[PDB]
From a paper:
MHC-I is a cell surface glycoprotein that is responsible for the presentation of both endogenously and exogenously invading pathogen-derived peptide antigens for immune surveillance. Peptides anchor the antigen binding groove (ABG) via interactions between peptide residues and pockets, denoted A–F. Polymorphisms alter the stereo- and electrochemical environment of the pockets, dictating their ability to accommodate different peptide residues, thereby influencing the nature and quantity of the bound peptides (4–6). The key residues, residues at positions 99 and 156 (residues 99 and 156), adopted two distinguishing manners to alter the peptide binding plasticity of SLA-I molecules, and their molecular mechanisms were further demonstrated by the corresponding crystal structures.
To understand the mechanism by which micropolymorphism 99 affected peptide binding, two complexes, SLA-1*13:01 with peptide EW9 (pSLA-1*13:01EW9) and SLA-1*13:01 (F99Y) with peptide NW9 (pSLA-1*13:01 (F99Y)NW9), were crystallized. The hydrogen bond formed between 99Tyr, and the main chain of the P3 residue did not impact the interactions of the sidechain of the P3 residue and the D pocket but significantly enhanced the total binding affinity of NW9. Therefore, the microvariation of 99Tyr/Phe could affect peptide binding but could not change the nature of the D pocket and the preference of the P3 residue. The peptide conformation of pSLA-1*13:01 was almost the same as that of pSLA-1*13:01 (F99Y) (RMSD = 0.175 Å), but it was quite different from that of pSLA-1*04:01 (RMSD = 1.110 Å). The two peptides of pSLA-1*13:01 and pSLA-1*13:01 (F99Y) had similar orientations, especially in P1, P2, P3, and PΩ residues, because these residues are anchored in pockets A, B, D, and F. The stabilities of these pSLA-I complexes were measured via the circular dichroism (CD) spectrum, and the midpoint transition temperature (Tm) values of SLA-1*13:01NW9 and SLA-1*04:01 (F99Y)NW9 were lower than those of SLA-1*13:01 (F99Y)NW9 and SLA-1*04:01NW9. Residue 99 was located on the bottom edge of the D pocket, and 99Tyr could form a hydrogen bond with the main carbon chain of the P3 residue. The CD spectrum verified that this hydrogen bond could dramatically influence the stability of the MHC class I complex.
Author numbering:
A (entry chain A): 1 to 275
B (entry chain C): 1 to 9
C (entry chain B): 1 to 97
């Protein structure tokens, strides 16, 4: 509902050879806008949508600076967490972070977050009040005490409340023609007679944005939604998304089943059938 | 704009 | 380590002899090291790979994609190699799924 800006950091350790790969991606809602990779020679913060090229080179230099520095913080942090868990230097390990802000009716911050995972598992998270931490295990209590005593919460809070939402507003203005348009699903139902007599009905939703959508199948006699084969929501390749939900129905009974499509790009919910 | 992430874990 | 889920699909409904985009979506995997190849009749196609990102559950997702004009004989498939799979996962493109 409210717009958001987020960054996704992935740091991977290299077995017994001291470096660490750092990958960062920037999103405004469900649209990737920036990227950074320190495998590249002379790594830089690079744009990955047309609109962010509105920003001049001052922006790109500064952001490049800050994600290079962040990148070495994550290298050290990898070696530290490997310390806490008493792991060897022969295996590769992963340190991930995601953080971001949602812009509220005020022009201010609705809510914001910062979460950290080690080897794919929850490690530490900032709480809703932006003044306290939640440690996922024994080691994250070490990190937690450290971060309370140093008031790291106020660094992430002043960022979320200040720079994060201000930049979010600017980015929403720059890409006004793409980021503020919710695009509804184009929908239709296909029919596949296939199991001697069972017929497969497949309800498609293509071309929509943002990501979140709901598709369910309903049968005329029953209040609960039907069992269905549902694919994970997937990118179209052009900035939109797509999904389908299918089920097998007895031959001749297709008009008992309805597909229900909910998306915030639609005026009201959509009912659709094999016509 | 990025956060500045500088404190050790 | 969690295995990857792999989807192969066109951006638009397939029409023989009319240009489209072939996508290979790979998600839910950990760790992030992976090999994703779009195959046209067993031979790797030149395709761009998206920048590494992850979901709220920390599992990774990547999109490999290139242009294609499908017909009634060309066989498209996506080949994935990850530490969770000892033999590669090949999923063949189907216009209906």
């Amino acid at each position: 509902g409210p717009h958001s800006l987020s960054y996704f950091y992935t740091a991977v350790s290299r077995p017994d050879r001291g470096d660490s790969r750092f990958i960062a991606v920037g999103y405004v809602d469900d649209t990737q806008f920036v990227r950074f990779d320190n495998y590249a020679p002379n790594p830089r913060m690079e744009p990955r949508v047309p609109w962010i090229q509105q920003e001049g080179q001052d922006y790109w230099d500064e952001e490049t600076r800050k994600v290079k520095d962040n990148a070495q913080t994550y290298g050290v942090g990898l070696n530290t967490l490997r310390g806490y868990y008493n792991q060897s230097e022969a295996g590769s390990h992963t340190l991930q972070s995601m953080y971001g802000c949602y812009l509220g009716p005020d022009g201010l911050l609705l809510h914001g977050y910062r979460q950290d995972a080690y080897d794919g598992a929850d490690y530490i998270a900032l709480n809703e009040d932006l003044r306290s931490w939640t440690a996922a295990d024994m080691a994250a209590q070490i990190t937690k005490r450290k971060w309370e005593a140093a008031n790291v919460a106020e660094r992430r809070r002043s960022y979320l409340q200040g720079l994060c939402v201000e930049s979010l507003r600017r980015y929403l203005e720059m890409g006004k023609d793409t980021l503020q348009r919710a695009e509804p699903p184009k929908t239709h139902v296909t029919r596949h007679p296939s199991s001697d007599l069972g017929v497969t009905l497949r309800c498609w939703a293509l071309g929509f944005y943002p990501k979140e959508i709901s598709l369910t199948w309903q049968r005329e006699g029953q209040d609960q939604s039907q069992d269905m084969e549902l694919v994970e929501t997937r990118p179209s390749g052009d900035g939109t998304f797509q999904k389908w939900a299918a089920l097998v129905v007895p031959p001749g009974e297709e008009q008992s089943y309805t597909c229900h499509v909910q998306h915030e790009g639609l005026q009201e919910p959509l009912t659709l059938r094999w016509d | 704009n990025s956060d500045t992430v500088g404190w050790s874990w | 380590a969690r295995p990857p889920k792999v989807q192969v699909y066109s951006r638009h409904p397939a029409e023989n002899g009319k240009p489209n985009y072939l996508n290979c979506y790979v998600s839910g995997f950990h760790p992030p090291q992976i090999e994703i190849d779009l195959l046209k009749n067993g031979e790797k196609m030149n395709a761009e790979q998206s920048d590494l990102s992850f979901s709220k559950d920390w599992s990774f997702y990547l999109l490999v994609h290139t242009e294609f004009t499908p017909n009634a004989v060309d066989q498209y498939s996506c080949r994935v190699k990850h530490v969770t799979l000892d033999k590669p996962k090949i999923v063949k493109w189907d216009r209906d799924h």
